[PDB]
Design a protein around this ligand. Structure first.
Ligand SMILES: N=C(N)c1ccc(CNC(=O)[C@@H]2CCCN2C(=O)[C@@H](Cc2ccccc2)NS(=O)(=O)Cc2ccccc2)cc1
Ligand SMILES: *[C@@H]1O[C@H](CO)[C@@H](O)[C@H](O)[C@H]1NC(C)=O
Ligand code: NA
Ligand code: NA
Lengths: 27, 251
């Protein structure tokens, strides 16, 4: 149920340095 | 990983290292999908043309790692294998069709800041995200170049490629159980998985629910980061019925 949510990122609402690159590619 | 960068701490907490017991060495990457199940490439365990046929007792899984070579005391956890399950129609004879395997751990691993499972895609998330141009992320401790080895886990983001372009880049027979990713020569960027990244995850972050999904497994490629070549990945969703059957039967 908690899959795919990283303790050091999503769980604390922090973004990693390049995840935005992925989002920007998703039309 | 070629032309990638150092991962951040906890960036890929589902990343698993498959580790050979004797001699002690990196065998492959893999991913954590629950507290007891690890996903990898079949060719990491079984590849007769190169005399590869590992059994459970040959290997360990190391979870929560960042450094490639160092024993990460109080951070990584090391698990023994209960059982290996290779896809019954894994095609090691020809083209690595259905390049997928599951490993059940002897004991459940405790999740932590550094250890956490990735999601497997549903049909809809797969249909939405597995599109040419959409980028995923590959991680691993494999070679930095085709022909050395990284201090810490490497990461690279790569676009999914149109199927006809994938097919036209190689003489190997491509199947619907594979997809390819990487930049084209014309584009101003590069990067690829390489030897040793095998079995590791190609992940995408769903913009709908903000969760990471494993869409692919590092499977094969002609060299690494060559112009006009692409990395090939096992299509996880296409093989999910098998994954579910194994876990339902043996879990
Ligand atoms: N993205 C990449 N560039 C990549 C990804 C994963 C691997 C590891 N896999 C593999 O190594 C699979 C397992 C068996 C052979 N194979 C290959 O990738 C072959 C091509 C082949 C494919 C299917 C059947 C027979 C041969 N190319 S290869 O050039 O030999 C792969 C290779 C690249 C660099 C160093 C050593 C090996 C290697 C490279
Ligand atoms: C690989 O190893 C297993 C167990 O030792 C064996 O039964 C099998 O025949 C071997 N070869 C292949 C192709 O699976
Ligand atoms: Na071709
Ligand atoms: Na390339």
């Amino acid at each position: 149920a908690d899959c795919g949510l990283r303790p050091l990122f999503e769980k604390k609402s922090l973004e990693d340095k390049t995840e935005r690159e992925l989002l920007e590619s998703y039309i | 990983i070629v032309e990638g960068s150092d991962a951040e701490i906890g960036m890929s907490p589902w990343q698993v290292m498959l580790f050979r017991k004797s001699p002690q060495e990196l065998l492959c990457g893999a991913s954590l999908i629950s507290d007891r199940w690890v996903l990898t490439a079949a060719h990491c365990l079984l590849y007769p043309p190169w005399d590869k046929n590992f059994t459970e007792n040959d290997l360990l899984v190391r979870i929560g790692k960042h450094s490639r070579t160092r024993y990460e005391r109080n951070i990584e956890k090391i698990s023994m294998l209960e059982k290996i399950y290779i896809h019954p129609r894994y095609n090691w004879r020809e083209n690595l069709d259905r390049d997928i395997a599951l490993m059940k751990l002897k004991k459940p691993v405790a999740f932590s800041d550094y250890i956490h499972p990735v999601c497997l895609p549903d049909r809809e998330t797969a249909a939405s995200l597995l599109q040419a141009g959409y980028k995923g992320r590959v991680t691993g401790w494999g070679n930095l170049k085709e022909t050395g080895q990284p201090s810490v886990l490497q990461v690279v983001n790569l676009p999914i490629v149109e199927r006809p372009v994938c097919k036209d880049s190689t003489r190997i027979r491509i199947t619907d159980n594979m997809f390819c990713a990487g930049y084209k020569p014309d584009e101003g960027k590069r990067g690829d998985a390489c030897e040793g990244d095998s079995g590791g995850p190609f992940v995408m972050k769903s913009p709908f629910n903000n969760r990471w999904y494993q869409m692919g497994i590092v499977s094969w490629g002609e060299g690494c980061d060559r112009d006009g070549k692409y990395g090939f990945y096992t299509h996880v969703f296409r093989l999910k019925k098998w994954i579910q059957k194994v876990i339902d039967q043996f879990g």
